[PDB]
Amino acid sequence: MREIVHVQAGQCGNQIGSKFWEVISDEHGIQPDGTFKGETDLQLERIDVYYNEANNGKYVPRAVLVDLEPGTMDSVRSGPFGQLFRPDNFVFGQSGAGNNWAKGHYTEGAELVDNVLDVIRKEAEGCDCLQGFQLTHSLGGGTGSGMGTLLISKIREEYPDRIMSSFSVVPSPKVSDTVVEPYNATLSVHQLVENTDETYCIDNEALYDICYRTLKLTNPTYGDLNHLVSLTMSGVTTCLRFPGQLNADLRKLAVNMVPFPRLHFFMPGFAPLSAKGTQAYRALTVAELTQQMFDAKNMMAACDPRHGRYLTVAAMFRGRMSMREVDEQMLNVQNKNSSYFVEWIPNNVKTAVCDIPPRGLKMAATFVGNSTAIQELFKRISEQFTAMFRRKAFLHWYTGEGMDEMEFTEAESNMNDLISEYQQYQ
Amino acid sequence: MREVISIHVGQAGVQIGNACWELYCLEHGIQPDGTMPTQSTNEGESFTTFFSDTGSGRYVPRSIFVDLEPTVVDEIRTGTYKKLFHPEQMITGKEDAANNYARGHYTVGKELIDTVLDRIRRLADNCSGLQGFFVFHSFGGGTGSGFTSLLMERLSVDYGKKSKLEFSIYPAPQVSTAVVEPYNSILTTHTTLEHSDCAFMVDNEAIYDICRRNLDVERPSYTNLNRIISQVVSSITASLRFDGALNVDLNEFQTNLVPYPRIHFPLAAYTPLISAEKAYHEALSVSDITNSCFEPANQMVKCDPRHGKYMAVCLLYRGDVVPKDVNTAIAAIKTKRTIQFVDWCPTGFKVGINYQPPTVVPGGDLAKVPRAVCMLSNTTAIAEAWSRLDYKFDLMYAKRAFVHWYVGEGMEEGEFTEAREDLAALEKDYEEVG
Amino acid sequence: MREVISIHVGQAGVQIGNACWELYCLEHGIQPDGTMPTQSTNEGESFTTFFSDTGSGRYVPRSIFVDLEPTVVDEIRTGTYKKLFHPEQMITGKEDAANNYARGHYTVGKELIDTVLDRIRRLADNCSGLQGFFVFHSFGGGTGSGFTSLLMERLSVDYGKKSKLEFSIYPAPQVSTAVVEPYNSILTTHTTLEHSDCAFMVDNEAIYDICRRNLDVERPSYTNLNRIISQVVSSITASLRFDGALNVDLNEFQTNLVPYPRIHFPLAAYTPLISAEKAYHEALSVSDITNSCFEPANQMVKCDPRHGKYMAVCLLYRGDVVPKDVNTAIAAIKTKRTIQFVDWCPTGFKVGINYQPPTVVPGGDLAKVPRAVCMLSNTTAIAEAWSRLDYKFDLMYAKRAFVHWYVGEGMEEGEFTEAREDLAALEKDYEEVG
Ligand SMILES: Nc1nc2c(ncn2[C@@H]2O[C@H](COP(=O)(O)OP(=O)(O)OP(=O)(O)O)[C@@H](O)[C@H]2O)c(=O)[nH]1
Ligand SMILES: Nc1nc2c(ncn2[C@@H]2O[C@H](COP(=O)(O)OP(=O)(O)OP(=O)(O)O)[C@@H](O)[C@H]2O)c(=O)[nH]1
Ligand SMILES: Nc1nc2c(ncn2[C@@H]2O[C@H](COP(=O)(O)OP(=O)(O)O)[C@@H](O)[C@H]2O)c(=O)[nH]1
């Protein structure tokens, strides 16, 4: 009915979903063969939203897997849950972006965009009414930040109506990951502020600080860092997949939060988060799960929450909970932290409660916030972007591909107007 | 799939290739006769970039051996590695150039350049994912300089966009053999700026310093020096020959490490590079060897890295390394202030971690260590390595010594003058950008 | 059923026939004494085109040996292949013609032409499906030219409509033996245009180039040169001796390859033709050897194929070949532009694939390869091979050298003049049609 495809592009977003589909497989009781083994039909009555059942119940995920090389194809294919994906969707090229935007946008990405465009068309023809798209890619690299950038510019020609979830990792102030990382940011966000509806700026740096303090894990496996990205995304779409006392789709999560057609740059949060041995020694109350959500520890990005203001507080609570204690404490945070909110927007808390917790807990909280300290995310990169344009370095990897110099400065003016709009109401 | 071709020109091309292809037979489990044992199929995971399949697992190297002299080629055609290579891939010469440019740029090269470019095209038409070139050469060789500049003058006409990689030896300012090496190094820099993506340099002496102190090899020769360079060669290919969490192909290396199309000459470094006993009394962590990367007893070119200014430092790790202390130690490098950058590039870092640890040569002098770093650091210490060689070239040129070999071989003397103004602004650009 | 007769005229007819009939005993499993072993009956599937049955499996070759000299015929009547052939099929001469036309067209030939045409008719009356003739001859022979032109002058009166095939050796413009070969090649072209369906040519030197480079035979002689030509002979017969998916008979060859009844002279080519060691380090695919068909180191006549214009290129494959890459590689030939056609013939292609791979001679220099191509390419490089021979004939004719042998043997000198105007417009027609 309400149907959503999930598209992965670039080496980052290809392996995020590879652990993320597993939880979606396990929350609904299916197998790598797609065999339904859920005991209660609560895991079946909304199985259709991410799946297209065909020929005796082998559910295929509504997923598209795109790469510029066959390197990341076989690793997902031979890896865990490799037999579940449809081999019709395994569309790829033979180039590799080499961390170059105009290769991923103009040169090499312009060839492979036509093949999956019909694949976007094909699964959307077999449904009654689409709902919106979710997209995992990168903003630091070259493949996902160059090819997935152009894909959103052609979804609006097909479907100018629905919503666009563009989940992508962002640079950190501490240690840069790639050399052209400020180049891959300003040129991407130039297209992200044009035709997208939400981005979740997840820092790679602060995810270790989550794991170093709460999880206390000395050996961060990349399966485990995306596992904390996995449980964040499954809590967002819990209303469309499970009943409860209050349901809230992705459009209701959209319409409650974004106040102006640019300011939709949100950071996520999740509670509870701790190691193994601290299970019994703390309390599973509404009050203990409340104050964890509003700490700098729970900030998945490396921005300071007491250097901004919460505009729209989204509380997606999961589990059998008492509504009044939710109604109690969401009042109590504004009686404590009235400076920490925007002042002219009253009643900043939006609450959606499904009565089903995720697997592994008894009561959880999925937070998405809007701090105006995310203005500093675009303050720090606009200087690093203009750190190398003043010396015109690496121009022969872009103009040699055929990039305009004004393409930098047009993005550079719209980058600096963006932080003026957080400044408008702060 | 992706397939990379190697070309070996000169005697430095011969025996370095006699080590690198020897090492790859160990790291994929391929017997040197030409076929594979059936146990090494699971190890043989995406080995297709170098080895065509033939009949039943028989794996020819996509490799070309080019020499003007048949002597050292017969060493390949005597040992165990004779039956591995293809015979018509071996194209030999008869008359030697003797470290002279126009003897290696016009005389014997132009009778053999048309034979070898076919063998390039015969092998490269099988490729659908042709990535790059491993061309190995010297700087003072007749075919090391005269044929290498002519060869790169012709493949850019043929293939163009596809990448290239050059490995070579930096001539030491104190200890070196051929007197024409200040001459030919200016000649091999003249027209190879335009026709080479990247070119790497190592010193004979900077190998020796770690050989005597850390390896404790007090009788080294060109046997063990080929093994140490080949580990740096193999560590780049580990991003391609295996499946890593965050790896990098050859087009991406030049995209990060070339800030300007003329200054594109970094160098290498490797650590931990010690003997087999000293690793027993020491637990080499991530912060141990990464801090060992940036001390002057670890660079592979004997120069002053503290008097150079780092611009784009590239890091490829091997072995089971967690990224947390990686994200700490590179930040802990930034806590130190002796590592100088330029004002416009703070973000010149590259992150690469592969699962496979380096495996050591059988009967060698190394030790099985899980952690290893192949450090690549483009810096302005190359400019200080330019002035030590620009001093040698001009003063012997002023007396016009040794000109009477270059005259009659089909070569002009004004070409020496144009390369002087060409190399003068090159070392200026390190200070202009810096 | 279908039955084909072979005629061997001249010493080139003798020993080439001593190889082809030697080769066919291997490819059908027939012992050279005359009978067959009972194991080779299943291999003996439709072998009836050459071998009559006698008594109990005793298989005489439908073959006629014609020579004016009894010497080389006695080599057949000494070796193991004496008891295979029929004695009254062997008709010998006594007095030699010594590479002279009217000595081979009138003198000794007219005493023996009535004996051999009966033996033609004695054998051909058994046929209900008489297809064609294998006549083997030279161009400078006395019986190679004088009797061959007279023989084809008489069988067209007898049989007419039924087909013919001529195999011969193109005289090289540099290295050849008999001085009268420019004379007799003009004579054997004079009246055999009207009396021959098709005639093929090979060079002595164009065999040698692949013998030295690819076979690595640095002592070749007329032993091994007969084996290489016989593989081209056997590959045509593989369309007839076996059961193929898409095969071709002798009437169909001339129907495709003769655009005009005068220009009907293509040549041959064979690949892969290498030694036994070089096939080990190489996986010869369909696109490998088909691209090897159209390079000038593979043609069997030493001329310029790039200066010739292809008109009707015929292809017969042998071995287990799939037609998909066939339909790709011939299209991939068309992706290249050096292969020039004429403007009016894009559709001059012939498709033939047989199941049986070529089997190599015992004790020979070849290697057992499944894939093989017998390329036939009529082109305008034959015209450039006409002008090199029309230059030789006229200048020796102008001084009237060596005329004093042609005079008294029953021959006229104006016949030399009429063949000049005959061959002048012939090489014109390559440029007229082209
Ligand atoms: N370490 C080491 N260096 C080598 C080796 N072979 C050659 N070289 C270097 O090559 C440089 C000069 O080039 P050569 O190899 O001698 O001459 P070439 O490259 O064969 O060129 P030609 O003069 O035409 O023969 C010397 O300075 C050596 O340092 C080797 O086996 N080991
Ligand atoms: N390669 C090769 N060429 C041959 C052979 N026998 C004859 N020829 C060619 O035949 C040409 C001349 O014809 P001959 O065979 O010598 O004379 P003929 O055909 O027997 O005619 P007569 O003069 O009547 O005996 C020479 O130029 C040879 O090149 C042979 O066994 N091998
Ligand atoms: N958690 C996690 N992050 C990853 C993984 N692989 C890549 N990334 C992140 O992806 C970013 C690099 O983008 P990437 O897709 O690899 O570059 P691209 O292929 O050129 O687009 C880095 O900031 C990494 O932190 C992984 O396995 N786990």
Tell me the three-class secondary structure of chain A, residue by residue: CEEEEEEEEHHHHHHHHHHHHHHHHHCCCCCCCCCCCCCCHHHCCCCHHHEECCCCCCCEECEEEEECCCHHHHHHHHCCCCCCCCHHHEEECCCCCCCCHHHHHHHCHHHHHHHHHHHHHHHHHCCCEEEEEEEEECCCCCHHHHHHHHHHHHHHHHCCCCEEEEEEEECCCCCCCCCCHHHHHHHHHHHHHHHCCEEEEEEHHHHHHHHHHHHCCCCCCHHHHHHHHHHHHHHHCHHHHCCCCCCCCHHHHHHCCCCCCCCCEEEEEEECCCCCCCCCCCCCCHHHHHHHHCCCCCCCCCCCHHHCCECCEEEEEECCCCHHHHHHHHHHHHHHCCCCECCCCCCCEEEEEECCCCCCCCCEEEEEECEHHHHHHHHHHHHHHHHHCCCCCCHHHCCCCCCCCHHHHHHHHHHHHHHHHHHHHC
Which residues between 342 and 361 in chain A have a beta carbon less than 8 angstroms from any beta carbon of chain B? none
Length in residues, chain B: 434
For C325-351, letters b (16+ CB in 10 Å) and e give ebeebeeebeeeeeeeebeeeeebebe
B134 — phi, psi (to 5°)? -100, 95
Tell me if C219 sits within 8 A of C227, measured CB to CB.
no
Residue C13 amino acid letter: G
Count contacts between A and B (CB, < 8 Å).
100
Spell out which residues line ligand 2, taking CB within 6 angstroms: C 10-12, 15, 68-69, 96-99, 104, 138, 140-144, 169, 177-178, 181, 222, 225
Interface test with B, best of C282, C285, C291, C369 (most B CBs within 10 A): C282
Cα–Cα dist A376/C311, whole Å: 74
Q: For C300, how many CA atoms within 13 A lie in the half-sphere containing its CB?
A: 24
Q: What share of chain C is helix, strand, coil (3-state, %, to 5)?
A: 40, 15, 45
Cα–Cα dist A293/A332, whole Å: 14
CB-nearest to B55 from C277, C278, C283 is: C283
C277 touches chain B (CB under 8 A): yes
Query: How many Å is the Cα radius of gyration of chain C?
Result: 21
Cα–Cα dist A410/A424, whole Å: 21
Place of tokens 């961390």: A99
A219 touches chain B (CB under 8 A): yes
| Strand, coil or helix: C196 | coil
| Strand, coil or helix: B328 | helix
> Which of B27, B153, B205, B252 does the annotation list as catalytic?
B252
* Closest ligand to Cα C225: 2
Tokens of B268: 């290498």
Tell me if A69 sits within 8 A of A90, measured CB to CB.
no
Which residues between 279 and 298 in chain C have a beta carbon less than 8 angstroms from any beta carbon of chain B? 280-283
Query: How many Å is the Cα radius of gyration of chain A?
Result: 21
Cα–Cα dist A132/A155, whole Å: 10
Cα–Cα dist A61/C107, whole Å: 92
Residues near C421 by beta carbon (within 8 Å), at least 6 away in sequence: none
Peptide bond into A272 cis (omega under 30): yes
Tell me the three-class secondary structure of C379-407, residue by residue: ECHHHHHHHHHHHHHHHHHHCCCCHHHCC
Cα–Cα dist A413/B76, whole Å: 62
B316: number of Cβ within 10 Å: 23
Cα–Cα dist C274/C276, whole Å: 7
Interface test with C, best of B119, B126, B127, B128 (most C CBs within 10 A): B126
CB-nearest to C283 from B34, B53, B87 is: B53
In angstroms, what CA-CA distances link C37 with C21, C31, C242, C254, C361? 17, 7, 19, 36, 19
Atom 22 of ligand 2 has which residue's CA nearest to it? Answer: C142
Centroid of ligand 2 to alpha carbon of A176 (angstroms)? 83
Closest ligand 3 atom, residue A204 Cα: 25
> Is A144 annotated as contributing to ligand binding?
yes
* Contact between C281 and B58 using a beta-carbon 8 Å cutoff: yes
Subunits with 3+ Cβ pairs within 8 Å of C are: B
> Is C204 annotated as contributing to ligand binding?
yes
Residues near C114 by beta carbon (within 8 Å), at least 6 away in sequence: none
* Contact between A178 and B249 using a beta-carbon 8 Å cutoff: no
Q: Which residues of C touch B87 (CB under 8 A)?
A: 277-278, 281
> Is C230 annotated as contributing to ligand binding?
no
* Closest ligand to Cα C14: 2
Instruction: State if residue A141 touches ligand 3 by the CB under 6 angstroms criterion.
Output: yes
Tell me if B249 sits within 8 A of A96, measured CB to CB.
yes
Q: Which residues of B touch C281 (CB under 8 A)?
A: 34, 54, 58, 60, 85-87
Cα–Cα dist A194/C196, whole Å: 79
> Is A11 annotated as contributing to ligand binding?
yes
Closest CA to B290 of B260, B328, B337, B248: B328
A383 — phi, psi (to 5°)? -85, -40
Subunits with 3+ Cβ pairs within 8 Å of B are: A, C
Cα–Cα dist C140/B136, whole Å: 56
- For a mutational test of ligand 1's pocket, the pick from B9, B11, B92, B227, i.e. the residue with the most ligand atoms closer than 8 A to its C-beta, is B11
The torsion defined by the Cα of B188, B189, B194 and B196, in degrees rounded to 10, comes to: 70
Residues near B260 by beta carbon (within 8 Å), at least 6 away in sequence: A393, A396, B429, B433
Instruction: State if residue A99 touches ligand 3 by the CB under 6 angstroms criterion.
Output: yes
C338 touches chain B (CB under 8 A): no
Closest ligand 2 atom, residue C9 Cα: 19
- For a mutational test of ligand 1's pocket, the pick from B14, B76, B105, B138, i.e. the residue with the most ligand atoms closer than 8 A to its C-beta, is B138
The DSSP secondary structure of B183-240, one letter per residue, reads HHHHHHHHTTTTT-S-EE---HHHHHHHHHHTS--SS--TTHHHHHHHHHHHHHHHHH
In angstroms, what CA-CA distances link C303 with B40, C336, C338? 50, 21, 16
Centroid of ligand 3 to alpha carbon of A109 (angstroms)? 19
> Which of C27, C153, C252, C384 does the annotation list as catalytic?
C252
Count contacts between B and C (CB, < 8 Å).
21
Q: Does an H or E element contain B91, and which? A: strand B90-92
> Is C347 annotated as contributing to ligand binding?
no
Closest CA to B279 of B268, B267, B288, B266: B288
Chain C nearest CA to B120, separation (Å): 15
Structure-determination technique: cryo-EM
With 0-12 / 13-18 / 19 or more C-beta atoms within 10 angstroms meaning exposed / middle / buried, residue C160 is: exposed
Closest CA to C427 of C149, C193, C201, C146: C193
Residue C171 amino acid letter: P
Residue A225 amino acid letter: L
* Contact between A222 and B129 using a beta-carbon 8 Å cutoff: no
Residue B360 amino acid letter: V
Which chain C residue has its CA at the smallest distance from B61's CA? C281
Tokens of A153: 């510019």
Residues near C433 by beta carbon (within 8 Å), at least 6 away in sequence: C259, C260, C263, C311, C342
C249: number of Cβ within 10 Å: 14
B53 touches chain C (CB under 8 A): yes
| Strand, coil or helix: B160 | coil
Cα–Cα dist B197/A12, whole Å: 28
Q: For residue B146, what is the DSSP state?
A: I
Pairing mode, strands B353-354 and B310-318 = parallel
Q: Which residues of A touch B344 (CB under 8 A)?
A: 387-388, 390-391, 393
Interface test with C, best of B33, B35, B54, B119 (most C CBs within 10 A): B54
Instruction: State if residue A212 touches ligand 3 by the CB under 6 angstroms criterion.
Output: no
Is B88 one of the catalytic residues? no
B351: number of Cβ within 10 Å: 20
